[PDB]
Amino acid sequence: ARVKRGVIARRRHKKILKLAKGYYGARSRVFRVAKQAVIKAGQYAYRDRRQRKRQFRALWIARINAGARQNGLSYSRLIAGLKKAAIEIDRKVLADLAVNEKAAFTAIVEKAKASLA
Amino acid sequence: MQLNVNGAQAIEVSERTFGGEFNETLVHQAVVAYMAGGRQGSKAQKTRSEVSGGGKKPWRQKGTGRARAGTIRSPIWRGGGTTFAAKPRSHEQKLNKKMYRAALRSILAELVRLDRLVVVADFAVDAPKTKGLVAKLDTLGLKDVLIVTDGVDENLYLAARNLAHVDVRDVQGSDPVSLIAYDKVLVTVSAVKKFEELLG
Amino acid sequence: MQLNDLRSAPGARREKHRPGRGIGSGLGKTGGRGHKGLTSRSGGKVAPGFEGGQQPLHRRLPKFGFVSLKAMDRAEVRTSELAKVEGDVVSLQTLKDANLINQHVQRVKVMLSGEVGRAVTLKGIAATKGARAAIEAAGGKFED
Amino acid sequence: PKMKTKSGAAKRFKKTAGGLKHKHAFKSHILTKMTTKRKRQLRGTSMLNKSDVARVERSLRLR
RNA sequence: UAGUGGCGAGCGAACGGGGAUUAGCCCUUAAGCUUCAUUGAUUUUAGCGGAACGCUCUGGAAAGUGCGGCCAUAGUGGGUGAUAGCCCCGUACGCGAAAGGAUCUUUGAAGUGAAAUCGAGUAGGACGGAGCACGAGAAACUUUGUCUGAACAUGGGGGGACCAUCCUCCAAGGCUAAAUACUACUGACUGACCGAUAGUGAACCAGUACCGUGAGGGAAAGGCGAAAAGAACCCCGGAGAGGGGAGUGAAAUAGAACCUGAAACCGUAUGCGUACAAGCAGUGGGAGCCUACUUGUUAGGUGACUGCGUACCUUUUGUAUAAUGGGUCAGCGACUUAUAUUCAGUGGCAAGCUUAACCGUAUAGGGUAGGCGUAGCGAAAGCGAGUCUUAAUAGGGCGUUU
RNA sequence: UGACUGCGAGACAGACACGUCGAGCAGGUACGAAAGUAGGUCUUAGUGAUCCGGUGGUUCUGUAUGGAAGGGCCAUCGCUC
Numbered sequence A: 001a002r003v004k005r006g007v008i009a010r011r012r013h014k015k016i017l018k019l020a021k022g023y024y025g026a027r028s029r030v031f032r033v034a035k036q037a038v039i040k041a042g043q044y045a046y047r048d049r050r051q052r053k054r055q056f057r058a059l060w061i062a063r064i065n066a067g068a069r070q071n072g073l074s075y076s077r078l079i080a081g082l083k084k085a086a087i088e089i090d091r092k093v094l095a096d097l098a099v100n101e102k103a104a105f106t107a108i109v110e111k112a113k114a115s116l117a
Numbered sequence B: 001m002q003l004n005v006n007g008a009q010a011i012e013v014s015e016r017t018f019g020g021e022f023n024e025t026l027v028h029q030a031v032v033a034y035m036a037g038g039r040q041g042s043k044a045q046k047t048r049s050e051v052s053g054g055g056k057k058p059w060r061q062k063g064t065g066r067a068r069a070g071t072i073r074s075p076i077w078r079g080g081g082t083t084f085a086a087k088p089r090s091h092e093q094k095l096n097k098k099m100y101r102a103a104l105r106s107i108l109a110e111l112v113r114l115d116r117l118v119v120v121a122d123f124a125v126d127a128p129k130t131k132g133l134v135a136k137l138d139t140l141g142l143k144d145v146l147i148v149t150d151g152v153d154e155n156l157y158l159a160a161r162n163l164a165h166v167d168v169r170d171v172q173g174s175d176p177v178s179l180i181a182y183d184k185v186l187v188t189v190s191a192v193k194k195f196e197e198l199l200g
Numbered sequence C: 001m002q003l004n005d006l007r008s009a010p011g012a013r014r015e016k017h018r019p020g021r022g023i024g025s026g027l028g029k030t031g032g033r034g035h036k037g038l039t040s041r042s043g044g045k046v047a048p049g050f051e052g053g054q055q056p057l058h059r060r061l062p063k064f065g066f067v068s069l070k071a072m073d074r075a076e077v078r079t080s081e082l083a084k085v086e087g088d089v090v091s092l093q094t095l096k097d098a099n100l101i102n103q104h105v106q107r108v109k110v111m112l113s114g115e116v117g118r119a120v121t122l123k124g125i126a127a128t129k130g131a132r133a134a135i136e137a138a139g140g141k142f143e144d
Numbered sequence D: 001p002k003m004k005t006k007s008g009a010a011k012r013f014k015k016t017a018g019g020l021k022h023k024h025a026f027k028s029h030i031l032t033k034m035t036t037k038r039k040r041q042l043r044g045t046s047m048l049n050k051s052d053v054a055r056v057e058r059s060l061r062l063r
Numbered sequence E: 001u002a003g004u005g006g007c008g009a010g011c012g013a014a015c016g017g018g019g020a021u022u023a024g025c026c027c028u029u030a031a032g033c034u035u036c037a038u039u040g041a042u043u044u045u046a047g048c049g050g051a052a053c054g055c056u057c058u059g060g061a062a063a064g065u066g067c068g069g070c071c072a073u074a075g076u077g078g079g080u081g082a083u084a085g086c087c088c089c090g091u092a093c094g095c096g097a098a099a100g101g102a103u104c105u106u107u108g109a110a111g112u113g114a115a116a117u118c119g120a121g122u123a124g125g126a127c128g129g130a131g132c133a134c135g136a137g138a139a140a141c142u143u144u145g146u147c148u149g150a151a152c153a154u155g156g157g158g159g160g161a162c163c164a165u166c167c168u169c170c171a172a173g174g175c176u177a178a179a180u181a182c183u184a185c186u187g188a189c190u191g192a193c194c195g196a197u198a199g200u201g202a203a204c205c206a207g208u209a210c211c212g213u214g215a216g217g218g219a220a221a222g223g224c225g226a227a228a229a230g231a232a233c234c235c236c237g238g239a240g241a242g243g244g245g246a247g248u249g250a251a252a253u254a255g256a257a258c259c260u261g262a263a264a265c266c267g268u269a270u271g272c273g274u275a276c277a278a279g280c281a282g283u284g285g286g287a288g289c290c291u292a293c294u295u296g297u298u299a300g301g302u303g304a305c306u307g308c309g310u311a312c313c314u315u316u317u318g319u320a321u322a323a324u325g326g327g328u329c330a331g332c333g334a335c336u337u338a339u340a341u342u343c344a345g346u347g348g349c350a351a352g353c354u355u356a357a358c359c360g361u362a363u364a365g366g367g368u369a370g371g372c373g374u375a376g377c378g379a380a381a382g383c384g385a386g387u388c389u390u391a392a393u394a395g396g397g398c399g400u401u402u
Numbered sequence F: 001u002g003a004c005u006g007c008g009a010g011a012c013a014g015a016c017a018c019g020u021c022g023a024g025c026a027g028g029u030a031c032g033a034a035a036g037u038a039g040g041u042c043u044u045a046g047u048g049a050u051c052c053g054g055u056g057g058u059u060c061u062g063u064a065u066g067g068a069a070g071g072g073c074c075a076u077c078g079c080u081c
């Protein structure tokens, strides 16, 4: 009939505080402060799954720009050339070539330069 | 239909009673109604009105900086009233007479279909000795058994009183819960006929 | 069949609403009561017939009629109910024995509703033209 | 305890098979200035409007 | 429901019916009741007896494991070193009172009922109140503060204004059990009641401490261990407090503020980071370092640097808002319950369905008084698959083909 | 004397309560030779729910019965509410 909340409530609070591990001050010790931090960190994490894809693409495009300008092309002209010559290598792989396989990246840039003119 | 008797030959019983379909939702309602009918319902708590003291306002409504309080027996307070304090109430549901009989018919038909009904020509013990009843039920190979007789014998009642998993009931005393709980339902031929008159 | 193997049919029994038990329940923090106003308050109920202070319908309209005290001892017995009487004679006391009229009923009238199964005698009981024809068609008769 | 019917509502709304009957307003005491057509068409009973049934059904303790 | 009601909010019968109980006696003096004898029955206030188990394993300890028995009108009781029908106390069952109380009874005695002798300042009336469901209403009836005031069974009262007829009763004198109400108190039994912030305010030396002139208000506070076996003795220390050994114990981080021993909060140790750096303190990316193995597409800890990023609740058109609330933790804290009812779902039965009180060796079965349905229309008399309106069988309203 | 009596298919309007228009049928009229027209006024303001009480009718009811009272129904009166 009478239901004590102590055991269930302790399990709830401990799950939140375990998620607040590593947080500063009351954000890792105090439940009603840690609860807000765990929710906000979750809001950030959801939003940063989207932002990670943007951040990495901006990083690939910048490295492709640097790599292609070493080969006499800007990023915009290289992408247009990679569409004129039907090359579907994506920017993640292109940015890996521009750093790690520079001879392979030079061959692709020359293939884009030839396609443009 | 035909109900086999351990001693004598098979007898003919009513299809309505011993061969109907199993209405599980109706049997469930009768079992739930029967268990609700056995509750004492005897408890209470105290509301804010019934807890000792608490007539005076603990402090003035404005100025002290505290949250406003009307009584120290507010259910918000430690030692105060129970918000919705229980009072002794009855838990018995109403079961229609025919609803009860239909559940009994379902239980009896299902007991026959599950081989959990044992029919014997008669069941009497001579002396009120538990050892005698144990010997009788061991010949029939029964350990957890409800014994249903047309008239509960005085010696039979005494002999089964201390037995661990044995219950002796009159036909009128065979509730839906005991017909389902016990592993077997040993029933005399007289009680089978008395069942037929009641439920058919 | 077992005590731990018994269910009611799907939809026979349901959980009750439990308001104010968190966000996920769908009834948290107001209990479906909205935000403010009388209807949200504890004990907040609008009286039956209350129209906001406008003249209520139960007072715009006039009182009419009177109740009939003479009609409190009367009952109507259908022709389909005459066959359920015992003893082939339909009377005031015989209709009470059959539980077709109440004990306080002092005058009975029969009207055509259903078929008179068997020939019966109506003793001290009035009938309509259609009921009288149907009763006499089945072989019945009337006595003062 | 058992519900108490509003006395005033029961005196103005008769329950028949088909709804609740009631008389009409505006037939009480200022009748010379009213046309015969208006007074004749305001005479008799009428069934309760759809929007007023639930409210009156609650005033009477039929719901 | 009838009725009542600023006919508002509300209040709210009776007749009739079903039940529980049942009882009637007198004023030409009784049924009863009380008291004191008295004859027998029980009952209560102490008690008595009360069955039947061993070996084995783990274990501090056996009641638990395994094997094999026995008692049961006694098997889900409480304990005993962990969970016992057979170890103890009990339990079913059967016995028991020197003495006192009580209840039924059989007789007897007075006492009372007892008002004496059939009802006069009474019935009726006027005024003003009260009660009758009835608030003056067309207001009967009861009752009486003021004032009046009959008749004598050939009479009188009532039947809801009032009158006549009819029916029914006999007021102004009394006594009367049962069915009904309650529980401060005593006992037993029980609980889909609580289990120390709960449950009584009060598990504890609680109506106490304490507060108040006073009436009055009114707490907090349970647990070592199976058993004190409650730590002999030695050492530091003030012949302290508190400790370190020793010992006891199954266990002492069970050491008396003693079961478990959470969180806030406060420390010590180690690892990494941190003194050119601007903000809800995270999140995405990410080097280095440390640790451990799986020896680098690994796990854990830290996290330089960097993108993005103004808590939560409430209330609002709108809140980072410099609007509200919260110092934190732990515990408690808010849609319940009863009775009537409507709709839905899911069952039983079906032109029928269902009982209430109540009875009932009692969740059964009986009880069908009642409620709803099978017919409507009409304010109603009434008529009736029709009815109402109307001069109208015409139109129209509602109803009828389930 | 149609500023008629019973109604009324069908609409407009509209939260409700109210409101507006109305062919046609019946009864009984007026005017016109007749077809016809007339259920007020060229139209749109001139109004007030319920309760309560009053007045005229009424085949309804009538607390044992017959009456009556009282109630219902139809008509109508009393609010610068």
Ligand SMILES: [Mg+2]
Binding pocket: B079, B080
């Ligand atoms: Mg309490």
Ligand SMILES: [Mg+2]
Binding pocket: none
């Ligand atoms: Mg029953």
Ligand SMILES: [Mg+2]
Binding pocket: C026
């Ligand atoms: Mg929502």
Ligand SMILES: [Mg+2]
Binding pocket: C035
């Ligand atoms: Mg709010």
Ligand SMILES: [Mg+2]
Binding pocket: C036
């Ligand atoms: Mg608002």
Ligand SMILES: [Mg+2]
Binding pocket: C033, C034, C035, C036, C037, C039, C040
């Ligand atoms: Mg609102």
Ligand SMILES: [Mg+2]
Binding pocket: C099, C100, C101, C102, C103
């Ligand atoms: Mg009946």
Ligand SMILES: [Mg+2]
Binding pocket: D027, D028
């Ligand atoms: Mg009128």
Ligand SMILES: [Mg+2]
Binding pocket: E050
């Ligand atoms: Mg013993």
Ligand SMILES: [Mg+2]
Binding pocket: E082
């Ligand atoms: Mg232990």
Ligand SMILES: [Mg+2]
Binding pocket: E118, E119, E171
């Ligand atoms: Mg007398």
Ligand SMILES: [Mg+2]
Binding pocket: none
């Ligand atoms: Mg008098």
Ligand SMILES: [Mg+2]
Binding pocket: none
């Ligand atoms: Mg009198």
Ligand SMILES: [Mg+2]
Binding pocket: E159
């Ligand atoms: Mg009378």
Ligand SMILES: [Mg+2]
Binding pocket: none
């Ligand atoms: Mg007398």
Ligand SMILES: [Mg+2]
Binding pocket: none
């Ligand atoms: Mg307490």
